[PDB]
Every structure is written in C-alpha cells, then in structure tokens.
Amino acid sequence: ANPCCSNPCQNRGECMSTGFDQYKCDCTRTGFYGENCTTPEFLTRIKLLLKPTPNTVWYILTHFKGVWNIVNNIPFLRSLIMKYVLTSRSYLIDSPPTYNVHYGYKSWEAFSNLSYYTRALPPVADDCPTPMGVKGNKELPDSKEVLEKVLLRREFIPDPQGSNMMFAFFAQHFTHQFFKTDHKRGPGFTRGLGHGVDLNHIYGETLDRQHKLRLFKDGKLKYQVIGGEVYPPTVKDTQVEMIYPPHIPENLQFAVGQEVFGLVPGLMMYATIWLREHNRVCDILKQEHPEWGDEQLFQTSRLILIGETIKIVIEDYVQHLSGYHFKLKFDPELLFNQQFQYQNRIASEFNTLYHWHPLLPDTFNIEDQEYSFKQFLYNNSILLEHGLTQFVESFTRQIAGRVAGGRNVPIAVQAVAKASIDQSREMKYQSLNEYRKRFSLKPYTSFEELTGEKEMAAELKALYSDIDVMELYPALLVEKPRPDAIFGETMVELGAPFSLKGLMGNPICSPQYWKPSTFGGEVGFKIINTASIQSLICNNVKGCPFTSFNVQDPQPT
Amino acid sequence: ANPCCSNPCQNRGECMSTGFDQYKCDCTRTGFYGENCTTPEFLTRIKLLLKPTPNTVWYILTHFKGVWNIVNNIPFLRSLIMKYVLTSRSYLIDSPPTYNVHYGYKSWEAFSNLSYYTRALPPVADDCPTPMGVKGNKELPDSKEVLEKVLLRREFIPDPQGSNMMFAFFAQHFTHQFFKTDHKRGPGFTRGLGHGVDLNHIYGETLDRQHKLRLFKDGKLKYQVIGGEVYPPTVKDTQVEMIYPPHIPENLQFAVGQEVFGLVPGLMMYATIWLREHNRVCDILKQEHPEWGDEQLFQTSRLILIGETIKIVIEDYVQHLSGYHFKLKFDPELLFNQQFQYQNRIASEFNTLYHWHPLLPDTFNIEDQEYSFKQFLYNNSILLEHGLTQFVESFTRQIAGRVAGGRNVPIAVQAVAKASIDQSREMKYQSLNEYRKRFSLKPYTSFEELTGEKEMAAELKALYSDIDVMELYPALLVEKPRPDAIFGETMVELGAPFSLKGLMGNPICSPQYWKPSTFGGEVGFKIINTASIQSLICNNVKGCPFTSFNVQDPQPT
Ligand SMILES: *[C@@H]1O[C@H](CO)[C@@H](O[C@@H]2O[C@H](CO)[C@@H](O)[C@H](O)[C@H]2NC(C)=O)[C@H](O)[C@H]1NC(C)=O
Ligand SMILES: *[C@@H]1O[C@H](CO)[C@@H](O[C@@H]2O[C@H](CO)[C@@H](O)[C@H](O)[C@H]2NC(C)=O)[C@H](O)[C@H]1NC(C)=O
Ligand SMILES: CCCCCCCCO[C@@H]1O[C@H](CO)[C@@H](O)[C@H](O)[C@H]1O
Ligand SMILES: CCCCCCCCO[C@@H]1O[C@H](CO)[C@@H](O)[C@H](O)[C@H]1O
Numbered sequence A, B: 001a002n003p004c005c006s007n008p009c010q011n012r013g014e015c016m017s018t019g020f021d022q023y024k025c026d027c028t029r030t031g032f033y034g035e036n037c038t039t040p041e042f043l044t045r046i047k048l049l050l051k052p053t054p055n056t057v058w059y060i061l062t063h064f065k066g067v068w069n070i071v072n073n074i075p076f077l078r079s080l081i082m083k084y085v086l087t088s089r090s091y092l093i094d095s096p097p098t099y100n101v102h103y104g105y106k107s108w109e110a111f112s113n114l115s116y117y118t119r120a121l122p123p124v125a126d127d128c129p130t131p132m133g134v135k136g137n138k139e140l141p142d143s144k145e146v147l148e149k150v151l152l153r154r155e156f157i158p159d160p161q162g163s164n165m166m167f168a169f170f171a172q173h174f175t176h177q178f179f180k181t182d183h184k185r186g187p188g189f190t191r192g193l194g195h196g197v198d199l200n201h202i203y204g205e206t207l208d209r210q211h212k213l214r215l216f217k218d219g220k221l222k223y224q225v226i227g228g229e230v231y232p233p234t235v236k237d238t239q240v241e242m243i244y245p246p247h248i249p250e251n252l253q254f255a256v257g258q259e260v261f262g263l264v265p266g267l268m269m270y271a272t273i274w275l276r277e278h279n280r281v282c283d284i285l286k287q288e289h290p291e292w293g294d295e296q297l298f299q300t301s302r303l304i305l306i307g308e309t310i311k312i313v314i315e316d317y318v319q320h321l322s323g324y325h326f327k328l329k330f331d332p333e334l335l336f337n338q339q340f341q342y343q344n345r346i347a348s349e350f351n352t353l354y355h356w357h358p359l360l361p362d363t364f365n366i367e368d369q370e371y372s373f374k375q376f377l378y379n380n381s382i383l384l385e386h387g388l389t390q391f392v393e394s395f396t397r398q399i400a401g402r403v404a405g406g407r408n409v410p411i412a413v414q415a416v417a418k419a420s421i422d423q424s425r426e427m428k429y430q431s432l433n434e435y436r437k438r439f440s441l442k443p444y445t446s447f448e449e450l451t452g453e454k455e456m457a458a459e460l461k462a463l464y465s466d467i468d469v470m471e472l473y474p475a476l477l478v479e480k481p482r483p484d485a486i487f488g489e490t491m492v493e494l495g496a497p498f499s500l501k502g503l504m505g506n507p508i509c510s511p512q513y514w515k516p517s518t519f520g521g522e523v524g525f526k527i528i529n530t531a532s533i534q535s536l537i538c539n540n541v542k543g544c545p546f547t548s549f550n551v552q553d554p555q556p557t
C-alpha cells in the first residue's frame, strides 16, 4: 500500500508519501535532483568521475608497501591521509541519529529514546506486500535452509590474514560494551545507554554496580590474589549480579563489569587484564598526585583507560583487520579544524554485521589441551589452572576462522547464527543491495557476482530467486572475500564508517577534553598516546609474554 | 588546603594540583601561556587590541536605527551578522559538557549522568578556607540581610523596555521545560533529561505521561470544550499527575505536560494555546497526508512545534529582550559551513541567572480586576471566567518589573529569592568576578562600579567587604542596568551564550533534520519558518487579538 515500499529514492534522498498512491523525494543536499534524486548536479558528476571504487582504494592500501613506508615516516603526510580517512568514513553516518526499528520517519521519540539501536536505513513499512518492500515472494526462504546450505561449517576455514584468538576474544570483549541487546524488549533495543566506548563492561552500566566493584581506596577496583596473580573479586564479596550456572564454586564466581563475561574464559582473560591495568594506572596517578582522593583517582583512571582502548582499537585492532600498509593514527587533533559531531548512537546494522560467528574455532587449544565448546563454556577454572601467561602464549598462535567466503559457521553456535537471520527479518531490514547503495556501492547484479563462485550462488538463487531480495547478514558471511583477506567488500565499507565514528565521536576526543590536565598531567596523557596491545599484556601479564593479533608474527630472541 | 582554591588560572586555563602545595595550569588552546596563562601569544594580543568591549557592541546594536534598516534588507549581510552572533556566543559554551556540582575535574560520571545540571565553572572545593576560595571571611553575609537591604521591593519598578505579562509568562512557560530542578536530589539536579527544547512541558517528560495526554486519533492531544473554546483535559479523564490543592474542583484540574502549570493561570494560558496549536497542525498535516496514521501525525506535529518555538524565541522573545535594531534570524543553514555541536547540556548557572523574580508585578490585572498573588495562585476559574482573549488583551498592556537595578523583588516571593541565594552557596558557586572573567568581562573593582550608585553599594560593602567575594545571583539583580534597559552587562553576556547554544544545539537544526520531509513537506516546513508570537495567538485565540511582548507597541485600526 505504502507508495514508498519500493524504496524509490536514490542517493540518500528521503521518501515521503503524498497521498495513498503517490510519493515525493526530498533531494536536499544529496547532490542530485529529479523525481528520484538520480540526476546529478554539475559539481556532482565531476566528483563521480574522479572518485575511485572501494576495491581500487583497497588495492592501493594493501599494496605498494615500499611507497607507504615513505609516507608513514612523513608526519604531515601521514596526518593528511588519516584525516581524510576519518572524515570520509564519518560522512556516511547520520549524526544526530534518525530512524530506528519503530520509525521509518524522523521523530523525537526516535531521537531521544536511548533504549533503541539507531538505524542506518529505515525499516520496511508494515503494510508492504513483500518483506523487502515490493520485490520477491510473500515469504523469505527458510532461515534454517539458508543456514545449512551456505553458512554451516563442513571443515574449519582459517583466516588468511592470520587473526588469532587474542584478536577474536578482544573483538568480543571490546564490542560487548556497546552491543548489549535488551532481549526483554526486543532485538532493536539496547542496555548500553552510553552508545559507545564508556568501558561499562569494566566498571558497570549503573552507578550501583560500579560502587560494588570499587575498593574506594586509591581509586582502585576490588581484587583478589590467587597464586601470586591478580583476579577479579567474587560475587560473594561484592554482591554484583553475574550469570553463572548453579554448579559453579563460590571462589570461581568472578565479578566484573559485564555480567556475561563469565561465559567464556577468553572474555574473563581480558576482563582480568583491564582490571590490572586500571589499578596499575591508579598507582601511577597516586605517585604523581599524593594529594588526590579516591574519587578523582578512579575517574581519571577511567578516562585514561578509555583513551588506551581507542588507541589500541585503532592502531592495533583495526590496523591488523584493515590489512593496510598505511600506519593508522589515533590523533583527535586531526579533527579540530574539521566539521565533526562528538556524539554517537549505536546502529542496529553495526550490531548485525559484527556477528562474526565464523571466527570461532572447532576447539580451544591451551598448552596441549583441546577444549571443546562444552568444556570451555563457564569454566573459569581453566583460567586459574593455566594462568594468563599461558593463555596469551596459546591464543597468540591459534588461528581464527574466515568470516567471509561462506560455510564456516561452527555448528555449536548454529542457533545463534539462525537468530541473527530471524531477528534481522523481525526488525524489517532492507535488502543487501539497498544497504550497498546506502554506503556508495554498486548493487550485485547476480548471486555469482556476490559469492565469486558457482555452487553457493546456485543454492541462493534457488532460495531467493532475485538478487535484490538477498538479505544483509547471510550475504556478509558468504560474500566473495578480497584476495587473501578475511572480509568481503560489503563488510568493510559498512563496518568502517560505524567503527571509526564510534571511536572518534567520544567526548574525550573533543578539544575541551583532549588535554593533559584531563588525564592527570603529561604522565597520564602519555599512557594513552603510547598504549598498545603488546604493552597492555606486557605490563599486566606475568613474564611480559609476546602477543599479537596475528599468528604470522615472529617472536624475537 | 587545595592549591587551586585561589583560582589562579586565567583565560579558561585549567588548574591541576601537582602535590599538596603546588599547582600547574593547562594553557592548551587558550591563546595564552605562562604559569597562570596570562602571557598572550602574538596572534592573541592582536585580537585583544581589535576586540571591542561588550558595552561598545551593545551601543552600536541599540543605536544607529537607520543604518540597521539598510542592513536588515540586505539578506547576505543579515545572514553574515547573524552567523557571527551564533558562532561567537556558542564558543563560550563547553560542548561536550564538563563539570557539575560534584566534580571540579572532568570525569565520565560528570559527562554521562544526565540528572546533573552541567557547570560553566567548576565548584569551589570542599577543603577551601573560604566559601569563594581564599578571599573573604569564613562565612558569607546573612542571605536574609542581603535580601532585605538590596533586593526587596519598596515600590514597583517597571521595565523601561516595556516587557509585558505576555512576555513574563512566556519566559516562565518556555524555560520551565529545561529548568526542572529535582529537589529530591538537590538544586544541582534536573528532571529534564532532554536538556533543551523538547517541549516536554506540553507532551510530558515520560512516554507514559505522553500516552495519557494523547487522543490517539489524528495525532492529536486530548481536549475538552468549555464555552465554545478548547481547554486541556481533566485529571479525571487522563489520570496524569498534576499539582493542585485539595479544594480544587474536578472540572478545573487541567492536565498538561508540565505538572506545575496549574500553579498560575498565566502558565495555563500558554499551555492551552500550544495545545490548540498542536491539534491545529495535526489537521493541516492530515489534510496533506490522508494516508498517515495517528503516530506519524503526532510525531511530525511535535517536530513542527519545536521549530515554531525556537523560531518564536529567537525572532520575537530574544529580539525584544535584546533591544537590538538588527533583525535576528532563525536559520539553521547559517551553521552548516561552521563548526558547531548539535547537542546541549543545561548549565546550573543558566538556571540561576534566569530567576527573574523582579519581573512579577504587585497584582495581576485582568479587565477591571486586580488579582493578588493569593487570589491568582492555582485559580484556573479565573481563566474560564475571562477567557484567553481577555487574558491576551489585558496581559499585553500590563508592564513587568525591571530585573536589574535592585530593590524590585516582590515580597510575596522573598522565600524563593532567598532560596536562590542559599542554593547558589550550597552548590559552591564561584564569585561574580570569576564568572565575569569566564565570559570575557573585566572584573568589578568596587561595589559602586557594580551598582552605578552609592546607597546600595555601601550596604553591600558592609556585608561583603571585598568586591571579589560578591555573589553572582544577587549581583545580577542589583547590577547597574544598561541605559533604559532591563538588564545589566553580566546578565546579557552570560545569558546569551547559554540561550543561543540551547536553541541551535537542537537536533532539528542539524543538516540531516533541517529539510521539508522531516516536517511533512513544504507546508509543514513553512509553518515553522513563518511562525511568530502574533500568529500563534491569532490562530489559536478567539477573535485573533493583537499581542506583543512590548506594552509600548501601538495596536492598529
Ligand atoms: C522508549 O521506548 C520503549 C519502547 O517503546 C518504551 O518502553 C515501553 O514502555 C511502555 C510504558 O512506558 C510499556 O508499556 C512498553 O511495554 C515498553 N515497550 C518495550 C518494548 O519495552 C519506553 O517507555 C520509551 N521511553 C523511554 C524513556 O525509555
Ligand atoms: C547520577 O548521579 C546521581 C547523584 O549521585 C546518582 O543518584 C544516587 O544514586 C545512589 C545509588 O545509585 C543513591 O544511593 C544516591 O542517594 C543517589 N544520589 C542522589 C543525590 O540522588 C545516580 O545513581 C547517578 N547515575 C544515574 C544513572 O543517574
Ligand atoms: C589512496 C589514499 C588514501 C585513501 C584512504 C581512503 C580510504 C577510505 O575511503 C573510502 O573510499 C571509498 C571508495 O572511494 C568511499 O566510498 C568512502 O566514502 C571512503 O571512506
Ligand atoms: C557590530 C556588528 C555586530 C556584532 C554582533 C556581536 C554581538 C555579540 O558579540 C559578542 O561580543 C562580545 C564583546 O565583544 C564578546 O565578548 C562575545 O564573545 C561576543 O559574542
């Protein structure tokens, strides 16, 4: 019924119904005009000729290693490139946010209600004939069939880029601070009202939980020492709510910021490292400021760890994931003379695309043990038996799975993967090609162009019939990967805007915050600007073991 | 004890303790360097020579009426001036926000906790020797004595600018949507978690209250008709919580967005006008979109009324209050090529300076009745007896009191005025001269320079001894007014940054929102861009009576 169901407006023009069977497109500041915003302005069709494809840019960034070695050592030139990366990626994100799962039009409810995930594309209206608007059949293909035919893993497919379990668990630990779906309300709702990197997974979402976790001395968090090494406090000693099965011992009920981090020993590893890091910074600050009280010590340390996190995510995590030879840079100063909104709202589509289930291996290998999913889940005693040093040594060398390419979702989590498909449909996501156009990509003209092969493409065409009906999430997992890469084109061109915007949109990156006094002086400031994934492990893990997000990296001496 | 108690850092440099008896100033991006950020950079002392005083600028803006008539009719030039007004005023406001009543340093608690009012200046630390830091005596002078000697009204002093009760009640109705002090927690806390113009005083702070107020037909709010004219629904028919004394009839318990708007018939007048305006816009939208449902009709109308409000506040309310001959302009487009944060946090100091108690008259005059404060309070039957048309006619011609100048606070509200002084001290406000320097003003060297006279200045010197100890709020009320103006220098130079930032920092002013489709097409968009205080009354009050914020304005025909 709704005349906008066909998604007629192009180039980010907004569709509005003007009667029962008529629409109008708002082409304001899109660079286009005409009934569907498809006729380019003069300056627009000029930029369209010069603009290189995402695959062309990707090639240049992952080749010519010698040239980039020159660029990386020219500070003014490195700053210029990184500045363009930040601004060009951010422009794809609406800030202030607009639509959500219940609003295909802008409203004050959609803007102010922080319990929603925001939406990069408005949901398909309820009164549309087909799930994707007007194209395709009345029902989408069986999610169970899609899962079994192109998604399930027959044999483990390793990541060509060499991403290890240090990476996989960092990814899950880091993103679980702003990907906290409120399942009481629905998949379109969140419990992370910070909508970004506030480190609530360390300090707790609410003030009540924060105070239960704090020691109220030297600004430190509560802790216990087992075998000479520091671990999170117990549920008994703190009274914070954690999710543990009833058969778990009292001593092993670790209490951390996020309540689900007891699920995996891999998550509790990072929970422990950051806990040590917080208290480490506390003592350093107390050294500089013997006149400070507990409160200022805690708060300043939290700001520093926020800085450390963004520093690490950009210059180590994203750096590895990008595969670029260009040396990325965390420098808030780069945006001081640019137009940029220091705010961010977590998009539902960001949550969906980050469901990197193929990352998980068949077993978790520590020392000479091959723990299964059954053995690994909720077993914190594994962490105490081996210790963090052993965990780092083992996980640095265990490779993770290839996300794109298809048929690599471990069967142990097939229910979670199916849920990602169903909830995607429940939230009325638009098609893959609609999201590709949203992020300046050419739509796929066939299933073969999508997968880059024949066998999986044929299975999908039998299920979907039309390429313009193909769903976003399963496409991301079956998409033809870039040569020797972990991702396809769609994952990067969608993920990058969300990711970089969420990191730089933090208030500590704003000019009024980004100064030494905010972080307790030059010493505290330097902790942020020199932070790295290696230094984090080196300072907080026994023996200062070698670590990296890449199994391919040689360990010296 | 705290080495920063003396407020040593100048020009918005940040003070940090570096030991028990030492401090360091962060002069980053202040334009100054040196131990106290007082030594100008070369480019800084150049700008300092060219920059005219606030009083010089005020003179030029309130004189040369013939020249401004020329400027006002040159669109490109009018746009250029207004752009400079917006950007220069906004630069004085920290966005993202920083300090609050409990944090003299930046912290994540101060940033994320929306229940606080933010602070333009950090509070005086608890362990300081004197209330204002180091200067003055151990105790501030008796608030009751300050109130009676320089604040209380001996005889009504009318506003020279001619502000009427249409103005006074608009001011109280408008600002009560973001000045909602949570007295359960303290004076430093708020219930308006929108921190701006969200019109929660019309639609309710929470979704539950919003739904009780809505009709769920045509996007309209609930209403009743009495004597042919429309009024808000009752508490009985809606079950929303209103604050009424137990002796008020059932029919007279009007239910509106803000729960305290039953207090004054003047407030309920504007509550009624905006209620009619919402439903008026609903029908206009339904005309354009017969295919729209109740929800989209309500939401779009709310966005339009938000636009109308900001339009009216800038081009009528602030226009009158400023006394400028320059024709101000609400145009979000002016900031599209500028650096500006579309967000805002309500400052506690904004709340304090807006306590314009001298505005209130001795009696409220409607027709030939002279209602007292006792008779006027909670008496909605006054509103029904006379009607809105009568209210507008009478209030347009009744003059309000002069805010600055001193000795004009009505004795009926002396308790509220005293509370403003006490709570100001409780929240550990810094001195007047510290706030003047914060907003680029020269400190007052004596009490006589402050008041511009001798009698009140002498009374203050006996109470405070030092001019650098004079408090902010009582200074604002006794300050020497500009010639024939309602305010002194401090009220304008503090109020203007807060005010303009709060209006333009709204998300509907952002590029992604500011387009016809957001407001239901060109028709809805035009409602905003043509809105005025006269057209608001004309469209929603019987007979389309003449109205204005100035008693001096002649009524035609
Ligand atoms: C934000 O949106 C959610 C979802 O609509 C609101 O939660 C609803 O609240 C009403 C009553 O206020 C309940 O009857 C519904 O069951 C809730 N829905 C869901 C899905 O939980 C919420 O009230 C809105 N406002 C705020 C401030 O969160
Ligand atoms: C925001 O700040 C307020 C004030 O500190 C917090 O309210 C306190 O909450 C604790 C428990 O959470 C109570 O014991 C205190 O009595 C409260 N203080 C006041 C003054 O009301 C609030 O919890 C903070 N966090 C949020 C999310 O609002
Ligand atoms: C080659 C010099 C460094 C360029 C770094 C830019 C990397 C990200 O650039 C991206 O390019 C895409 C394709 O052009 C665009 O669609 C995106 O908007 C842009 O962010
Ligand atoms: C004369 C041409 C129009 C100028 C309009 C500027 C009005 C507000 O200008 C104000 O001037 C003050 C004193 O210089 C400054 O302290 C403020 O930062 C600035 O906002």
Ligand SMILES: CC(C)Cc1ccc([C@H](C)C(=O)O)cc1
Pocket: A085, A089, A318, A321, A322, A328, A491, A492, A493, A494, A495, A496, A497, A499, A500
């Ligand atoms: C896909 C996303 C989650 C990770 C990612 C990968 C690459 C980049 C680079 C810096 C880019 O913006 O091109 C950013 C973020």
Ligand SMILES: CC(C)Cc1ccc([C@H](C)C(=O)O)cc1
Pocket: B085, B089, B318, B321, B322, B328, B491, B492, B493, B494, B495, B496, B497, B499, B500
């Ligand atoms: C004092 C404040 C509450 C009202 C006010 C008065 C004047 C102005 C002008 C536009 C200015 O910025 O100079 C803005 C706001």
Ligand SMILES: *[C@@H]1O[C@H](CO)[C@@H](O)[C@H](O)[C@H]1NC(C)=O
Pocket: A006, A007, A008, A034, A035, A036, A038
């Ligand atoms: C706009 O799109 C509609 C359907 O999406 C199509 O019928 C129409 O021809 C298009 N208009 C132009 C000018 O291309």
Ligand SMILES: *[C@@H]1O[C@H](CO)[C@@H](O)[C@H](O)[C@H]1NC(C)=O
Pocket: A374, A375, A376, A379, A381, A382, A385
């Ligand atoms: C947890 O691991 C320990 C070895 O550290 C093992 O003995 C135990 O059986 C495991 N628990 C489960 C439920 O697999």
Ligand SMILES: *[C@@H]1O[C@H](CO)[C@@H](O)[C@H](O)[C@H]1NC(C)=O
Pocket: B006, B007, B008, B034, B035, B036, B038
């Ligand atoms: C800075 O201020 C302190 C006290 O406020 C004063 O003693 C000192 O001399 C000042 N330093 C300079 C360089 O003016």
Ligand SMILES: *[C@@H]1O[C@H](CO)[C@@H](O)[C@H](O)[C@H]1NC(C)=O
Pocket: B374, B375, B376, B379, B381, B382, B385
């Ligand atoms: C309210 O006003 C009416 C006149 O409209 C008057 O009769 C009544 O006494 C007033 N009530 C109070 C409490 O003053």
